[PDB]
Design a protein around this nucleic acid. Structure first.
Lengths: 316, 316, 316
DNA sequence: TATAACTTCGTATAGC
DNA sequence: ATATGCTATACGAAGTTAT
DNA sequence: TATAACTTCGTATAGC
DNA sequence: ATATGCTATACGAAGTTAT
DNA sequence: TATAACTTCGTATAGC
DNA sequence: ATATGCTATACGAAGTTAT
């Protein structure tokens, strides 16, 4: 909606105050809230608590996730916080509602989902199928999956690696520099996969080139120092790779039926936990600084570690 | 008190809103609060802050633990929260009090107790005395202690295991399914102890039978699919076993003089921590999802792990 | 300022209510706040929110750290909390300010500093230079550094160890008792360094003597059971030792250019994390009970542990 | 051209 | 067991190019 | 019957 | 270092059965 | 005496 | 990702002793 858009074209005096992704959500939420206000004849701004309360129930009644509802409330609070007005959340009507909503949804067995894990068994299998391939796409995709699994980097970080970010370390292994500002080390095998992609694509012809680039139907790579592969394409590589082994996905429309952008990070974190790796080393592997946050991420450890069986059988 | 009882027979429109144990405490607290109100001539409901404040001080002045006092305040807040009335806790008189109370009690050196640990040395010792026994009670009790230590399950969970929950895994070891929904793996030795109990008691004659059942003075087991051993009896097994090795307990009336229902969970958690097991694997062993919660549980690690001595002596 | 001093000579009915260090800070803050109030003509007590707000901005505008600003606000809240007056912090003007202040400072890239690490490589190097020394000062200093690194004890705890606190454990290693109430174990090598210091200084002539004592320019030790080395002298040993290997420090006036009192605790914690030691064992090594607190301490792990490279190369 | 292989986009929701 | 704030990924679909 | 071996119960308090 | 909400275990004692 | 080697002190800031 | 409360260390400098 322009009234919201045309206007949201206008305001918030200092752009760099919020992330672009953040601005996008504020706008989507504002469109939603505005449309609901229009249909139900309520005042859009400043919002009235009883109205916000009813709007949140409306989201819940349409099947939205608690995190989604928290998001809409979040933006509303923002919009408002910026023009110095009591945030909808500080109205006790909105507070009781978010509480009720959380409780029901939970008692409804609802819980935050998580990407389908791409683990070491998955990596070895894909490597089995793909390693001998002479297809440019396969060479690129396999290097991408190796990095994703080895480094646990998010797709947006991987899309932004430039050739100059790569250096060598112990044994010839590659080291990838990630700016705000760490260095990610690759194994000999993954370094080898990346070296192949680099050699075939010619990305190293200009050190400012992004490590990964498009590969057209012709099989011709298009190195570039100004254009990154979208995070959407990187998610597509995970999806394609899944299709390759398992065929097309069930038409349920449910999320996570195939690997996605977060799959290798989810998978590698579970593998480290399953292997008895300590928390600090797991934290370093994925760049976490909060233990609570890392443990929530690995809440779906998916194999039995049998620490008590091992102790009782004394190792064995 | 019936006024509280006879009435607490009446209300709270949807039972399944609170756990039965929860209802029990609400009632005990209500009886306490009502009696105090009666003796001191105060209004029981709705409660007045200054009165709640004085009632909490009364609990403290009678030697109750902070967790106990928090409990009584907790129920009072509830009773009240349900009929939409400011919770006693939101009165600043009650807030300052709980704060003062916590500080003094603490400065008084008071700290949350913990069950006497039943550890691997304890398990091996009991196994030494009991393993050759031909007494039905000993066969049952030793299997119970093996499961408790190996699985870290709470007594209420152990009381509810049915024979059909048991399956086999790698090596013939048993796997015990625990519904809301995990699988607990037993060592070869504990599986063997459980197999013996199963074989002698005949519980496996009906898969719906609870794994553990009563054993009368005659030595005749009474398998059942409708009646569980009480958690009280399971605590009694820990107590009896302690008496067996250490004689009767000192008459101080202090808690935790003998092993209790939580002993093997406390003990096994300390053993895993002492053996250098990682946190995620310790969490999986006992079913924890919050790191803070697992670490508070293992706050009494009771042997020196000497990580710095090992590093300095380089392992050794 | 006496008005603040001469008066802060007077009040707070029960000294042992706050730590002496705490009283010192309250006084320094009160002097600061009073001087600012004087210069700017504002009322010192009870403080007005708008005034506190401006005073905090004044601290920020003079380049102070967020933790420093929180400190001044902290004492102000105290002074006030004690005479039952709304704490400056409960004024929304002070709340918004602390929030704004935290955000800017952060966005300014400001982050809590940490002592320069004294790690195992540092300990081995210093031991290389110093171990053959016949200088009383070197013998004492090397034992001090060994204890600091091995035990992770704070300088105030080390200053207070008395000879009677020392006992022997497995292998002749020393055990040091630390009262509120743990036992710190020393390696064979560090025990040996401590034994030498003990033998040369004669501190063991009276078991009540503090383990570490002054060593005058003459090289004559002064054992004592009533006087401890100051924590300032212990920090000086770290500084001197750093100078010994690296020369004098850059005149930038920046903190942490040389080792300080917390260096060996920072260093040993990083070494344990880097060696794959589990969190509970790291917690026991340094006396931590909160996982969050231990992880924040080790937020600067300074070598690559390569958990994913190891897994991929399968250990190797 | 058809099309592979992307890119952009908006709502939904996980993770730091 | 836990609440809120900001920024990321998820993914169907519609738009874009160089075949 | 006496009694072992439970079960139920209420207040107290640990743990998720 | 930390507060509150809900549900568990702790345990003496009194009630129950099948000896 | 000069001085090493401390101690005390006040403001600044990390860590429990 | 996070706020507040209390107690520690950081360190330049000025004061103290026994050389």
């Amino acid at each position: 909606s322009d009234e919201v858009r045309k206007n949201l074209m206008d305001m918030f005096r200092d752009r760099q105050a919020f992330s672009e992704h953040t601005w996008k959500m504020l706008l989507s939420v504002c469109r939603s809230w505005a449309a609901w206000c229009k249909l139900n004849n309520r005042k859009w701004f400043p919002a009235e608590p009883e109205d916000v309360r009813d709007y949140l129930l409306y989201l819940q009644a349409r099947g939205l996730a608690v995190k989604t509802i928290q998001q809409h409330l979040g933006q509303l609070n923002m919009l408002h916080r910026r023009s110095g007005l009591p945030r909808p959340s500080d109205s006790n009507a909105v507070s009781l509602v978010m509480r009720r909503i959380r409780k029901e949804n939970v008692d409804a067995g609802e819980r935050a989902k998580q990407a389908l894990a791409f683990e070491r068994t998955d990596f070895d299998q894909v490597r089995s199928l793909m390693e001998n391939s002479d297809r440019c796409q396969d060479i690129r995709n396999l290097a991408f999956l190796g990095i994703a699994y080895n480094t646990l980097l998010r797709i947006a970080e991987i899309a932004r690696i430039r050739v100059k970010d790569i250096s060598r370390t112990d044994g010839g292994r590659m080291l990838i520099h990630i700016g705000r500002g760490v260095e990610k080390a690759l194994s000999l095998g993954v370094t080898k996969l990346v070296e192949r992609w680099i050699s075939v694509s010619g990305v190293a012809d200009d050190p400012n080139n992004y490590l990964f680039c498009r590969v057209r139907k012709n099989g011709v790579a298009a190195p570039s120092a100004t254009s990154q592969l979208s995070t959407r394409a990187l998610e597509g590589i995970f999806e394609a790779t899944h299709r390759l082994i398992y065929g097309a996905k069930d038409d349920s429309g449910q999320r996570y039926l195939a690997w996605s952008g977060h799959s290798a990070r989810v998978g590698a974190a579970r593998d480290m936990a399953r292997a008895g790796v300590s928390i600090p080393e797991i934290m370093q592997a994925g760049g976490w600084t909060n233990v609570n946050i890392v443990m929530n991420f690995i809440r779906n450890l998916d194999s039995e570690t049998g620490a008590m069986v091992r102790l009782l059988e004394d190792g064995d």
